[PDB]
Specification:
- The structure is cut from a larger assembly and holds seven protein chains of seven kinds.
- Chain C has 51 residues and is an all-alpha fold.
- Chain F is mainly alpha-helical and 98 residues long.
- In chain F, helix 2 crosses helix 4.
- Chain F starts with a helix and ends with a helix.
- The chains are: A alpha+beta (440), B mainly alpha (56), C mainly alpha (51), D alpha+beta (418), E mainly beta (47), F mainly alpha (98), G mainly alpha (55).
- The structure holds cardiolipin (2 copies), 1,2-diacyl-SN-glycero-3-phosphocholine, 1,2-Distearoyl-sn-glycerophosphoethanolamine (3 copies) and protoporphyrin IX containing FE.
- One 1,2-Distearoyl-sn-glycerophosphoethanolamine binds next to loops of chain A.
- Chain A: It comes from Sus scrofa.
- Chain A: GO terms for molecular function: metal ion binding.
């Protein structure tokens, strides 16, 4: 194959639906292991200030027992077959999945339906998980990146439910009752909002029969989603006891289904990423990475394209000592401007190659493919094939990158989060002025 | 809106912002001097040389 | 020069040509305005009345 | 998707290729060149060598390698264990020739320029400090230092005193003595076998021999304790178990999954872990416990790793060790061993799902054994393991001399003798 | 490479604390540690 | 003969009267700075003392005795290969930049 | 790479005096009269020099 025949030879995601509206999607291989999961259109952005944290609490109680499998029994079953049960929650999505052997798919599927359908939500377990969730909140406080991105979401989407954190404030953790959680599950764990994905040695017809045997009870065939205003704003938490400062800056980027995402991702690949444990250092094609390695300006920087249904965070996060924040801002915004006005074809080619490599390398293993299927059916209503992603990347050039980075970056108000010894984090007006060029 | 159109067409780029400022400075000098002069010669009507020169 | 030339630098030239010509028009208009150069100003309709 | 093609050349080099027709290709050169081949005079040489890819080679400058691998979106990674070094290039299947020329320049024609080498000593400190931000890195380093006298006693990281002193001559001598053909295996996922043969022909003709014959690892049975006050205490207590690829090694794998070898369920309770249940019977403080298995070509380490509160360290360790002794006393059901076998087999099959995992398995197999065996044979070897083999292994651990490494506030941590 | 890495590497930065048994679960080591470096990737260690 | 002219010019240039080699007299731009930074330490120290002695000599408006003058056939172009490699790297970066 | 505003020896002085100078956030209109004084000085030099062209 020539990577054009290899893309054309990738197995096809097969999608069906139950009468209740539960979608069933699978990518089959010849591997002897599979990943099967449920992805739900439920998150913190669906929570208000009183219920905020309920979804994380329900994820916490997910494996602690159902009416059929009390307490540890479920875990025992999973552990007794060599399978791995995992879960996660975001501001928009929730997922419960099993990594099992291909011959364990029936039981795995059964284990999932029970988990999403019949969680006990027992009050004793609710108190134990209350204690656990409080300790995990204090554990999350120690992670400067998690805090700085929660801050970025809180100031960018202030007044909206997208500013909410996934876990909610600790006061809600202490106040959430069983009635709160049962209401959350009854309003958000619905078949039309769920996707049963499976990647690996899984036949779609057999998975569909399993879903019709285990999920057909679910809601047949309503509060959901209001848009979230973006705000140019800054939140600076100064703690000079912290050794390194974290700075996250983002403009309003596109939502999930916007084609602008493909050129913008290309542009982010042009800026790239860095940390001080890199081989390439000063020789890196990314200008910011080479300046950061030559001057030791930062410990790391990453570009990001966070997407929600209708908006997102397009920007960069960097970590540096107190005396270099300013420099890190100057060279980062400059790169943004250099892309808006003078993108240049060869680095667009490099960024396109980086994006194709990221997309292909990410989908390695049954679990990434299962997540791709579930999250893709939630965000696009479809699994976009890699051949299509390649078609969209192939139609990117320096004119396209210049135009889209102009549309999203140039002369736009960013949202800014600073955490730590951030006295040298530039004043908001100085950053905002760094978002345009007078020469241009 | 009108100001959205003005920003999108004339203000977003600094070169075009500056060109708008230059053309506006030219036309503003003309119109502002014309108006201020008319005001001054109305306040002082008949008193100035221009008003009375045509007799000499 | 040798360190210059090449496709990337010609592409940068093409990219910045609109901005350069726009600043050229800015300097042109500003110079016409500051020195009241009638050689051009006599053709601008309303400004024509100033002479 | 074709079948794995495995051949061994007259120079002793192994080449194995599987063309899966995946859009990306991954090429790994696996070498018997871990830190177990260092001696007391060149400690840290192989750590700097791990950091030394992307330096100038005879066929490409440092700038050329960095820029030309990033141009195609490619990846160049070096992963070391105590016994092996794997150099992997991963990119799209249309750009594999460029990456393979880069990889072959990196491994077969390194220049180790004195100024580039002296400008790389700082990443020894950076790299080791980043690794030592995990409390287990230094505990495992100390466990190997205290379990062995010479060879596996060597750290994967450079000694602090050796930083800024690893010379280019040490790197050149190291490559000249360990990067030889009969110590190398080129394994390509997503490539054709004749392509890998042509690649292995254009280079990789250093000596076609066995290089420097490293020493046999000598069991020490010592104890290293690192008081550093950390809120938690990390303790590792092991005995010598068996070398990789044997019936005893498989019994030790089954015993690791009987005792408990990591969590299956997120935020669970580790219900099927007998060690975890033994510790949670009496220890009501936050803790973790697992069985630890470290198999190597000429030896192995089997034991217990515990993380606990400083105050409850002794109770956790005694609880875990006594559970192991109870298994050594013949208390082990058939259902628990069936469950352990299921865990082990599922974990093995899940490890090779990714291209990285499958490549690593094929590379280590080609180095250690010089032959590839399909997962079905691996699984039936797991099946063959009997109950008495597990009971044994546990007996051998209990009756075996112990090496221990702990870190944290150790005022309540026991010694190997108490 | 093209992908950023599950974890970027700040030296001289406290990483994360573990306060619960649920978080502590999985942090015990079971296999020998490997060390990985990369041209354009965060360095990793595994146990 | 080209070498007659070359040895004549080497005598007439007169940095050999100060004990200097040709590479000691090179104007130090950025390429030459990196080339000097890449020298082995013994050659660097020889260069430093030679140059310090020549500065000390010109401070007195003096030259060395003719026996101590650098002979034309014994001038070591010690800095030439490092400079050529530095310049090759710069040229490669520029070729990439186009 | 550098920001010439911070690295250039003249622009470094200018930058530290009037651009990146840390100033109290609450100084009132009464703190304006420094900049007025220096402006008055310049005006006096400007008009006086033009007076000195004829005086
Ligand atoms: C013509 C319009 C201006 C123009 O084209 O400026 C281009 C250029 C700035 O272009 P840019 O791309 O917006 O700047 C980004 C840089 O990375 C610069 O990034 P930075 O972070 O170093 O600086 C951002 C900001 C920093 O702010 C300043 O430099 C402060 C400006 C003066 C403030 C008052 C000081 C006290 C009096 O820069 C500026 O404000 C513009 C440059 C300085 C202009 C100074 C004018 C002073 C008039 C009195 O400035 C110059 O080339 C200066 C010389 C030309 C001026 C006109 C002749
Ligand atoms: C209503 C009653 C009559 C007008 C106010 C009378 C009075 O004594 O107001 C004091 C009162 C200030 O009391 P303060 O806040 O203790 O004084 C702070 C400083 O004045 C500094 O305050 P600032 O920096 O906001 O600027 C205010 C300052 C501004 O002063 C200047 O700009 C310089 C004036 C001298 C040249 O002028 C004054 O405070 C005094 C009046 C100046 C002439 C009008 O003036 C105002 O509230 C601001 C002016 C309001 C004018 C209407
Ligand atoms: C005696 C001494 C004291 C005298 C009085 C002092 C007070 C009055 C003078 C100063 C008034 C305030 C400054 C007004 C100008 C200003 O802020 O400009 C900022 C502005 C920036 O303002 P900005 O940041 O709001 O907007 C720029 C950003 N974009 C482009 C996205 C909108 O400077 C510029 O724009 C510079 C470029 C344009 C300059 C003008 C070009 C045309 C000039 C005429 C033709 C040529 C001659
Ligand atoms: C009187 C001159 C103008 C003073 C008031 C405006 C000012 O202080 O700055 C205006 C202009 C914009 O500067 P700034 O917002 O810093 O953006 C630079 C690019 N990032 O900054 C300038 O320096 C404009 C220079 C115009 C000539
Ligand atoms: C220093 C800048 C040049 C100053 C020259 C003297 C100023 C001057 O003459 O300004 C007025 C003049 C008006 O235009 P004028 O020369 O009368 O030509 C009209 C022909 N129909 O305007 C000019 O001549 C402006 C010419 C600008 C300089 C050339 C570009
Ligand atoms: C009182 C005020 C004194 C003047 C301010 C002195 C400091 C700012 C002037 C220099 C400047 O703005 O340089 C910026 C830029 C150079 O390139 P750039 O990558 O944009 O910035 C790197 C260095 N700042 O400059 C340019 O690119 C200039 C572009 C041509 C001019 C329009
Ligand atoms: C410190 C700044 C200055 C101050 C405070 C100042 C003050 C004065 C004053 C009060 C007068 C008398 C004005 C009047 O006629 O009523 C004057 C006159 C004059 N000054 Fe200055 N001056 C200053 C700077 C300068 C400079 C720098 C020059 C020359 C370059 C200058 C040239 C003159 C001239 C020529 C006159 C006489 C013309 C006249 O009377 O208007 N001045 N100055």
């Amino acid at each position: 194959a020539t990577y054009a025949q290899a893309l054309q030879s990738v197995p096809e995601t097969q999608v069906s639906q139950l009468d209740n509206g539960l979608r069933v999607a699978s990518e089959q291989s010849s591997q002897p292991t599979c990943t099967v999961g449920v992805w739900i259109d439920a998150g913190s952005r669906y929570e208000n200030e009183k219920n905020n944290g309920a979804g994380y609490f329900v994820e916490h109680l997910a494996f602690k027992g159902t009416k059929n499998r009390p307490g540890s029994a479920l875990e025992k079953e999973v552990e007794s077959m060599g399978a791995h049960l995992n879960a996660y929650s975001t501001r928009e999505h929730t997922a419960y999945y099993i990594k099992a052997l291909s011959k364990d798919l029936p039981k795995a599927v059964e284990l999932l339906a029970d988990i999403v359908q019949n969680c006990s939500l027992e009050d004793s377990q609710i108190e134990k998980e209350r204690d656990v969730i409080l300790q995990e909140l204090q554990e999350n406080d120690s992670s400067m990146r998690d805090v700085v991105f929660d801050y970025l979401h809180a100031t960018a989407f202030q007044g909206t439910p997208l500013a909410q954190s996934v876990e909610g404030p600790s006061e809600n953790v202490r106040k959430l009752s069983r009635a709160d959680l049962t209401e959350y599950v009854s309003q958000h764990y619905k078949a039309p909002r769920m996707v049963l994905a499976a990647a690996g040695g899984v036949e779609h017809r057999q998975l569909l029969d399993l879903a019709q045997k285990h999920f057909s009870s679910l809601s047949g065939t309503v509060p959901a989603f209001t848009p979230c205003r973006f705000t140019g704003s800054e939140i600076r938490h100064r703690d000079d006891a912290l050794p390194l400062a974290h700075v996250a800056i983002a403009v309003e980027g596109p939502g999930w289904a916007n084609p602008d995402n493909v050129p913008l991702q290309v542009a982010n690949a042009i800026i790239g990423h860095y940390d001080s444990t890199y081989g390439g250092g000063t020789h890196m094609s990314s200008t910011l990475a080479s300046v950061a390695a030559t001057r030791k300006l930062c410990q790391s920087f990453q570009t990001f394209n966070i997407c929600y249904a209708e908006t997102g965070l397009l920007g960069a996060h960097f970590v540096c000592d107190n005396m270099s924040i300013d420099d890190m801002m100057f060279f980062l915004q400059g790169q943004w401007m250099r892309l808006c006005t003078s993108a240049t074809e060869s680095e667009v080619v490099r960024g396109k190659n980086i994006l194709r490599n990221a997309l292909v390398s990410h989908l390695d293993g049954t679990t990434p493919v299962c997540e791709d299927i579930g999250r893709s059916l939630l965000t696009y209503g479809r699994r976009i094939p890699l051949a299509e992603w390649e078609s969209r990347i192939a139609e990117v050039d320096a004119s396209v990158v210049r135009e889209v980075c102009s549309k999203y970056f140039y002369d736009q108000c960013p949202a800014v989060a600073g955490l730590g010894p951030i006295e040298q984090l530039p004043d908001y007006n100085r950053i905002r002025s760094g978002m345009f060029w007078l020469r241009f | 809106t009108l100001t959205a159109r003005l920003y999108s067409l004339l203000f977003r780029r600094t070169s075009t912002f500056a060109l708008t400022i230059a053309v506006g400075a030219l036309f503003f000098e003309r119109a502002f001097d014309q108006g201020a002069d008319a005001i001054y010669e109305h306040i002082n009507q008949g008193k100035l040389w221009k008003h009375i020169k045509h007799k000499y | 020069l040798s360190r210059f030339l090449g496709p990337r630098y010609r592409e940068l030239a093409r990219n910045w040509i609109p901005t350069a010509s726009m600043w050229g028009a800015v300097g042109a208009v500003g110079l016409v305005w500051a020195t009241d150069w009638r050689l051009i100003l006599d053709w601008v309709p309303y400004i024509n009345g100033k002479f | 998707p074709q079948d794995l093609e495995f051949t061994r050349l007259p120079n002793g080099l192994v080449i194995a290729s599987l063309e899966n027709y995946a859009p990306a290709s991954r090429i790994g050169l696996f070498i018997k060149a871990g830190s177990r081949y260092e001696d007391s005079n060149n400690l840290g040489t192989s750590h700097l060598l791990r950091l030394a890819s992307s330096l100038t080679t005879k066929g490409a400058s440092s700038f050329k390698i960095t820029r030309g691998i990033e141009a195609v979106g490619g990846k160049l990674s070096v992963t070391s264990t105590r016994e092996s070094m794997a150099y992997t290039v991963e990119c799209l299947r249309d750009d594999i020739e460029i990456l393979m020329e880069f990889l072959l320049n990196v491994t077969a024609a390194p220049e180790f320029r004195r100024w580039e080498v002296a400008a790389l000593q700082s990443q020894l400190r950076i790299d080791k400090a980043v690794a030592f931000q995990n409390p287990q890195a230094q505990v495992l380093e100390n466990l190997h230092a205290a379990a062995y006298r010479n060879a596996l006693a060597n750290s994967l990281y450079c000694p602090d005193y050796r930083i800024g002193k690893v010379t280019p001559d040490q790197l050149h001598y190291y490559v000249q003595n360990h990067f030889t053909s009969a110590r190398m295996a080129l394994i390509g996922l997503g490539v054709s076998h004749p392509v890998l043969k042509q690649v292995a022909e254009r280079f990789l003709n250093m000596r076609g021999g066995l290089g420097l014959s490293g020493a046999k690892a000598k069991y020490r049975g010592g104890e290293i304790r690192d008081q550093n006050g950390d809120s938690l205490v990390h303790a590792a207590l092991v005995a010598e178990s068996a070398a990789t690829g044997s019936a005893e090694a498989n019994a030790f794998s089954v015993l690791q999954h009987v005792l408990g070898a990591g969590p299956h369920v997120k935020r669970g309770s580790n219900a099927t872990s007998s060690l975890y249940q033994a510790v949670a019977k009496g220890v009501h403080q936050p803790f973790d416990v697992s069985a630890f298995n470290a198999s190597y070509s000429d030896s192995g380490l089997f034991g217990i790793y515990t993380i606990s509160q400083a105050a409850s360290a002794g109770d956790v360790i005694k609880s875990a060790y006594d559970q192991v002794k109870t298994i050594a006393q013949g208390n082990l059901s058939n259902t628990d061993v069936q469950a352990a076998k299921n865990k082990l087999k599922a974990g093995y099959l899940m490890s090779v799902e990714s291209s990285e995992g499958f490549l690593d398995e094929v590379g280590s197999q080609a180095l250690v054994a010089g032959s590839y065996v399909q997962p079905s044979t691996v699984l039936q070897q797991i099946d063959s393991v009997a109950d008495a083999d597990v009971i044994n292994a546990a007996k051998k651990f209990v009756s075996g001399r112990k090496s221990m490494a702990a870190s944290g506030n150790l005022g309540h941590t026991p010694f190997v003798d108490e | 490479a093209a992908l950023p890495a599950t974890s970027e590497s700040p030296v001289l930065d406290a990483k994360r604390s573990f306060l619960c048994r649920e978080s502590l679960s999985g942090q015990a080591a079971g296999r020998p540690l490997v060390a990985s470096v990369g041209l354009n990737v965060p360095a990793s260690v595994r146990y | 003969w080209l070498e007659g002219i070359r040895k004549w010019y080497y005598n007439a240039a007169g940095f050999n009267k100060l004990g200097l080699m040709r590479d000691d007299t090179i104007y130090e731009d950025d390429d030459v700075k990196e080339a000097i930074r890449r020298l082995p330490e013994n050659l660097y120290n020889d260069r430093v003392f030679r140059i310090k002695r020549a500065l000390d000599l010109t401070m007195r408006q003096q030259i060395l005795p003719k026996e101590q003058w650098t002979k034309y056939e014994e001038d070591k172009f010690y800095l030439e290969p490092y400079l050529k490699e530095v310049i090759r790297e710069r040229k490669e970066r520029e070729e990439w930049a186009k | 790479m550098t920001n010439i505003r911070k690295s250039h020896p003249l622009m470094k002085i200018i930058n530290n005096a009037f651009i990146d100078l840390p100033a109290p956030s609450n100084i009132s209109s009464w703190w304006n009269f420094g900049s007025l004084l220096g402006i008055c000085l310049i005006l006096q030099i400007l008009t006086g020099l033009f007076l000195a062209m004829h005086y």
